[PDB]
Amino acid sequence: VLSEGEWQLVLHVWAKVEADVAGHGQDILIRLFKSHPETLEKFDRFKHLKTEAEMKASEDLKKHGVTVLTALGAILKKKGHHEAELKPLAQSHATKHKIPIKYLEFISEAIIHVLHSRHPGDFGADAQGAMNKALELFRKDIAAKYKELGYQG
Ligand code: HEM
Ligand SMILES: [C-]#N
């Protein structure tokens, strides 16, 4: 588990994201698509976008970013007690979108990257360490459901 003190750092950084969900969501999906171009092929919805400028201009992409971050906010707020919220996502990600586990590791890193970019001086080492743990917990739990269904990875 994460300690009560680590969960506090996590939820404290999350309050910063909640101040501007749409902006954070956009920077995160952009960062993921430019850094690991293979991820963009999984989205029939966004596969037409080519440059950073075009990505930035998509209202649909901004809308989807809010959706993703709201789902992840829900999860974090359960402080590890997130089975009901996590099972459905794993199932969809595994069996419908066909997303490999390693891509989840990629969006995790894009999340930490944005947080450093955006709040250079607030988001310190200790908070970074807490966030990392929280994201690994999420990945561990998903992978367990993926193995169950036979998509391990
Ligand atoms: C923080 C990790 C993630 C969260 C919370 C998340 C959450 C969501 C949610 C809530 C949806 C819409 C409902 C659903 O179908 O599940 C969604 C859709 C989708 N997700 Fe994720 N996702 C995550 C990571 C990823 C990654 C890393 C990829 C691919 C690289 C991916 C691919 C997609 C696709 C293809 C869809 C359908 C998009 C569309 O056509 O509307 N997801 N995701
Ligand atoms: C999912 N994005």
Side-chain angles (χ1 to χ4, degrees), residues 32 39 42-43 45 64 67-68 71-72 89 92-93 97 99 103-104 107 111 138:
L32 175 72
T39 62
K42 294 297 195 172
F43 295 80
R45 197 154 159 193
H64 174 81
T67 293
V68 173
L72 179 67
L89 198 147
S92 68
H93 287 57
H97 303 326
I99 302 313
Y103 287 7
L104 299 157
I107 195 165
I111 296 167
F138 170 77

Side-chain angles (χ1 to χ4, degrees), residues 119-137:
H119 313 287
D122 287 333
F123 189 60
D126 56 355
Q128 185 181 338
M131 183 72 72
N132 186 65
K133 281 177 71 20
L135 286 177
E136 286 186 315
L137 170 65

